[PDB]
Curated annotation (Swiss-Prot), chains A, B:
Domain Peptidase A2, residue spans: 20-89
Residues of the full protein shown: 501 to 599 of 1447
Residues the record marks as active site: 25
Sequence segments annotated as region (Dimerization of protease): 1-5, 49-55, 88-99
Recorded superkingdom: Viruses
Oligomer and partners: Homodimer, whose active site consists of two apposed aspartic acid residues.
Originating species: Human immunodeficiency virus type 1 group M subtype B (isolate BRU/LAI) (HIV-1)
Name this polypeptide is given: Protease
Length: 99, 99
């Protein structure tokens, strides 16, 4: 599809057997999801943006479906105010910017 | 152009007569630039990001050119980690997400 940017580019995703709403975010290198109790091992990480840093848990090789497009990669889980789909997964679903 | 996301979508912008680099950021409602001198009156504003809230200077109706495309809109100036072009200006240059 083609998504205009009048409003936030929010889409439904499926991760860990749950459906959630997430932003298609070209400004995020990687993907950051709201606190969830995912199974498996993880590594601690600190990620910075406007306002400072938050602490997140880094999970690898996590399967995510975005608008029916499957992808698998790194997911950072922590107290983010929004679910963020970053470039590491946007490349996998074929997402481009166009103007 | 069509821009892939295997690298950060960085572009050259012109604002206040100065060339800068900025990130095309679909996850940003607003455009926020690092500290700079801008010709124009301004108003104190707050904006929130992944790590909390910061104070910014809000410049309304500012001329800004993005990868050769002209926009006139609001630009926030303050301690952002990176110059970001948000949806308020992405819509002006006709930018869409496509997959
Ligand atoms: C560094 C560039 C940029 C931040 C300037 C990176 N962000 C992504 C960017 O889209 C954020 C997304 C967002 C965060 C919170 C709430 C809503 C939307 N928008 C943003 O702050 O927007 C500002 C201006 O407009 C306003 O509307 C929305 C909020 C206000 S991030 O979220 O900080 C991030 C993500 C992953 C990762 C990192 C950092 C580091 C490692 C990891 O890869």
């Amino acid at each position: 599809p083609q998504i205009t940017l009048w409003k936030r580019p929010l889409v439904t995703i499926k991760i860990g057997g749950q459906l959630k709403e997430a932003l298609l975010d070209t400004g995020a290198d990687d993907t950051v999801l709201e606190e969830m109790n995912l199974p498996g091992r993880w590594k601690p990480k600190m990620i910075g943006g406007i306002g400072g840093f938050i602490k997140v848990r880094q999970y690898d090789q996590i399967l995510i479906e975005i608008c029916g497009h499957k992808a698998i990669g790194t997911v950072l889980v922590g107290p983010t105010p929004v679910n963020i789909i970053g470039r590491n997964l946007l490349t996998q679903i074929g997402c481009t910017l166009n103007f």
